Assembly symmetry: D2
Homo-oligomer: 400 residues x 4
């Protein structure tokens, strides 16, 4: 039931049914720190990275045809979800992500070797380092995967989620221009505005959130691949950085390019600190929008009672704004995640920032929580918001 | 493969092999927000809570023998680990934890009903709300679970890990009193201290971490159970609060009591915000300790090189033979996670409204994560780094003698003027202070090392 | 109009009317970073430190009688507020506080020299380093002053302020047990509780805040003095640490003692990070209390309207809960101050944490803002809170 | 020595030499909360605001010639710096900034009334609310001032300081291309890079800081003025908003416009929260740069020793001759202050209620402080550290040759096996790779240095 693998530290046992190699197993044994594995979309991004690197390596004459093709077939299968069991390493590993890099290197080599020899594992004929990792360091590969992942998640999770919110905020309030409600400043009675007008503030906040995302992504399109170990490009052929980036742009259909200065790309993660800053602003916007709805839906008899919130689950008969609670909790999570990203980003030393996994784990969590909670909020709260017109009219007609 | 269940809102389908009910399945369908489930030890805390509440209810005559005994047996199976598949709800739910409370209520009833009738699910003979949740709200139950879980995790994970680090810091540095290294202030050359003395700082930081936890636990021992919906204790018999706390104290063997003021326990989580603050401080201490070990072991040739860190894996694919301080990296990364987790807890804690703070799941999720991560990573750091740390004594000595600031250790022993002559001679010929001491016939190489000792 | 002073870097000009010396002026010229000077109470604490050190030095036989007496007279005058013009250095200086240490050393020497020779300044007969700073480093003196200051401010500003709040929360609500109001969970109508009961939550929060302060001060009583440059005590006579601490305990009438491990005292500021943690919890408590009052006083016609807040200043006739706004802003300040203290505390290197001035500036600001805002809040809001009983009764009698 | 004034609440005394009125003195007596006054540049912004609002009002025919001209002349004297004593109110006031708005309204009226009548104070001929505050609320005025001040400070303090740092990073490192130092990853010995290349990272961080500011300013150019109380623009004539923005654009020479949606501008300060986020990133960049320079200049003998930092003062009283990297300490301390200031702004920004975010003073206070501190400290760091940085070239070379990881730079030039023999020889005899290269007749001391160059 076991296979033996090795590296420069010696022999090590791996359970036969798993495709990973000596360094993954070594990491798996030595870092028994909680159960948070690397996010699926990061693994996906890392797989895309190896795919594109292999193609460039092949085109440069540096890989045998059968090895390049076997690596490519092997990676296509990972992208289809066939080896989700085979990336067991935790986030809390080496700060450069070396081990997760080797996790991808070894699994690809292993699948390819099973195709070519009939048996998985090992370094023949496909070597994890000399073929799958050819011309790469973890120091430039892991940041490249961090940026690919961030872009993919933002374009697939967050931007649609915000557009879903924008659309329903627009559609619901289109005809609330006839509803004249009483404004509150300091929570004290103020002068009148329409309910549509009040909701137009929220619409502006979300529109502006979408604009901030576009500006924050500009540096996240820029990829470190080609800097190798310390930023100089040692062991990377001239042109690799540019051709790799074009390859990733073509597969993702996103405008990726190479980072003009690779030293800045390795030594720091300022792009992601800035990006996390935009996530934080979005958290602030949503906290305000959700809090107002909580407040306007308070009651039914001893609150404000201007809005009726959909009732989705069960002091019997009492129904709570549960979606607002889920969303406002996520907002507080994102704000704390941002402080972690800040502090980790500030702790770079010379040629390398070695806080990379904690940074990307927090970025990707914030994107996913914001997207999922907003979509839930729209479906189970915003879509069925109705104003209580008689209540709004009574409140207005009492104002001094 | 499906069973039908019902609540106030109507009919709903549950996959047959699972034990939860209608309200849990409803929540499962309505809060599809990522993948972060309630932590194992919080579910455990909540089960313990229900076991004790059912026994007190039974003592008050408010549960029949058949029902109280089956509830108790069902809960023991959950505490045995037999139903870890049956708590699927995410953290990002209602802010009171109602759905997770009800998840526990339904699963207990369901296990009991299978035992009594042969078929799982439903509300007869055992009813989730009327029996399992009798005399309880989620408003007082969930805060009770939060504190039980915090105490359990702190005592089972955190205190043992810090003591593990303490013991090995003490053991490893016992005989480092004769290793005389150079002090660095502002990262600039300073005067000497023993390697042991430098480690004594770290030891003190961990001893103080342990004291801080004991003070931080004081209010976490106090339980909300009995406040019910708003804190008034309506639908709760006089004495239930005290008798429930006693039971939990017996089962856990921890000094749990009831909170004097139930309103404070529902409306806020200041106790967990204070506790998070202590976790924050521990993160700050560990960051300093781990950073020093990394800095002291930097090299092997182009850095400081005073400590040899155990080499556990290959550090690089391009540069073979390179070994990195990977355990320090995992620990310092965790430290940054705890610092951020603390801000989340702070902000959530500050957003209470009137009778209830409804940010409860996110608060307890961060507290428990911070505890697990500090504990797991400290344990790993000890096993794979502290255990095998060795000083590079020859390198430590070389560096000590390079310091020009040794002059001020020489002043009281050799005289102010004479030390000045040595330091002048060392600048002119470009030699060490030791070599200049021997050159001018003031002090041998052995007499020089004795004066330099801290004393 | 100028006097010339010097140090090992050479000669430097000081305006004649000022008492400080070469190193203070040098710092004053080289760190032109905003206008935040060291807090008054820190300077005060540093002056107390030099007073007690001199007395111990004198008792050990290490100072001439006339110098010890002149130093003591000189310091008594600083404590009386006579040289508030003479500590111009900014917080954003060397991270060990050396320059502010020399600021105190030089000014004391200067005043003493004016007494003894008729002219201020210089190092004769009282030398800033060899007499006023005898047996001291900035590395152990500045942490000692940080802890003295924190204790003094907490005992003189914060503890009385919280007791003032506790007392008035108690007195105002004593007879609110007859007022039956409707409870709100999730801001939805709930079951009843008395107004006194609701206020008893707030009373508990403040009581518990007072208990947390006592626990957090335990390590802040422990003083670094005697560790000198790197923690070893080089150039400090045996017994100095203990006798100094007793001297400070006697002058302040507070239970100060020496730090058992001086290395921990220099290398880190974990005591203050923990203390700042308690300030943060207090900020959280007060934010809740103040927010509820904002909410319960909302109206007069379109809010909850359960409480009447005092009207202290001027949509004419509209009066806002201005004291609650001041207080809740301070709370957000304290929470951010706490993150600065955290991050700075985490950045220690080997024998010394060199973020000391930013840490103490934030600690002392949080104490002063919390105290002043709470006292203001009590005087201009809590003292005159009255319930609107008819409104409370109407709301209750509408509950489902 | 006193003058009497009045408002809705009654009679109140003001010291005679000051120009403020009844509402300012009331606020002065009721908010005795520490000492933190409104920043100079925010007061200036608010004056500019009133100058432009009065001119637009006059153009609409809603101020008489006498009154508009005297208002304009009074404001110019405030912008000249003639009344810096007359704005005593603390930051910790009402959350809308009403009292500071009224401080400006009263002082302008008072200066104008002295000019027109000979006696300062009061509300005739110039009335604080009816003339100086005409068509304005504090709800739209204070946010307008916040953005004007942020733009002014960013353009006058921050952008110049970052450009100053940029210019000197470029100038100092121009000819450091021939200095070949060793790279460190995980603080472990790695492969070489030029000193210039290492500095190129820092240069990139600052160039990107400047781009980030330009994007962050986009929404700060947009002004609330015209929304009045709740955002509807009641008591504001159509066109006032556009014409006010134009005037401010003319006076400042900055591209200010009116905010399309006034409700968003009153109810929140997301734009300043986003801007704070950019300041945060700049703090993170500077922390890395300053920390590296400190680490590279550590020593002078027992650390890294690659850079010589200019020595500006004595570092110690016990250890004479010790010099500390004091400018790096002041800058990194400021960085921690900005990071905390950002959390305050984030939390304050998140506590808006309906039509108004009433945490405005604390938000703008932190933003402006962060800008001033980053600017002042970067400027000082350049003058007193970056300007005079020199590499210690002999030390840089020594360290480079100690690296065992040079082997991988030798592989493509000398062959894999041959480099292995050199590294084996270097381990056996305990020498450098260069000495072992010459020993085995593979490579001279000059040919070795050429292969090592990054290329
Ligand atoms: Na987090
Ligand atoms: Na601050």
């Amino acid at each position: 039931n076991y296979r033996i693998e090795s590296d420069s530290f010696g022999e090590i046992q791996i359970e036969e049914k798993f495709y990973w190699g000596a360094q993954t197993q070594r990491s798996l044994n030595n870092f028994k720190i909680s159960k948070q594995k690397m996010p699926k979309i990061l693994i996906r991004a890392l797989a895309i990275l190896k795919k594109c690197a292999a193609q460039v390596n092949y085109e440069f004459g540096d890989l045998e045809y059968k090895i390049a093709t076997s690596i490519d077939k092997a990676i296509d299968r990972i992208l289809a979800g066939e080896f989700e069991d085979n990336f067991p390493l935790v986030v809390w590993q080496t700060g450069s992500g070396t081990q997760t890099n080797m996790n991808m290197n070894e699994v690809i080599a292993s699948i390819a070797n099973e195709e070519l020899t009939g048996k998985k594992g090992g370094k023949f004929p496909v070597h994890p380092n000399d073929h799958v990792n050819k011309g790469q360091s973890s120091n430039d590969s892991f940041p490249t995967a961090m940026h690919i992942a961030t872009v993919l998640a933002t374009k697939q999770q967050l931007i649609p989620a915000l557009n879903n919110l924008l659309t329903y905020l627009q559609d619901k309030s289109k005809d609330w221009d006839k509803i004249i409600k009483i404004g509150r400043t300091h929570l004290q009675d103020a002068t009148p505005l329409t309910l549509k007008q009040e909701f137009s503030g929220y619409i502006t906040q979300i529109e502006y959130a979408l604009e901030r995302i576009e500006d924050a992504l500009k540096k996240v399109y820029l990829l470190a691949q080609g800097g190798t170990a310390v930023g100089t490009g040692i062991n990377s052929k001239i042109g690799f950085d540019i051709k790799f980036a074009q390859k990733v742009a073509e597969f993702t259909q996103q405008p990726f390019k190479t980072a003009p200065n690779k030293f800045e790309s390795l030594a720091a993660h300022d792009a992601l600190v800035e990006f996390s800053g935009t996530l934080n602003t979005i958290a602030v916007s949503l906290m305000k929008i959700a809090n107002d709805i909580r407040l306007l839906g308070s009651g039914p008899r001893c609150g404000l009672g201007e809005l009726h919130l959909p009732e989705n689950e069960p002091m019997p008969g009492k129904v709570n704004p549960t979606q607002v609670e889920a969303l406002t909790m996520v907002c507080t999570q994102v704000m704390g995640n941002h402080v972690t990203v800040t502090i980790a980003g500030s702790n770079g030393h010379l040629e390398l920032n070695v806080f990379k996994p904690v940074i990307i784990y927090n970025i990707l969590q914030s994107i996913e929580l914001l997207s999922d909670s907003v979509n839930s909020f729209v479906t189970h709260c915003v879509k069925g918001l109705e104003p209580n017109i008689a209540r709004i009219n009574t409140l207005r007609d009492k104002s001094l």
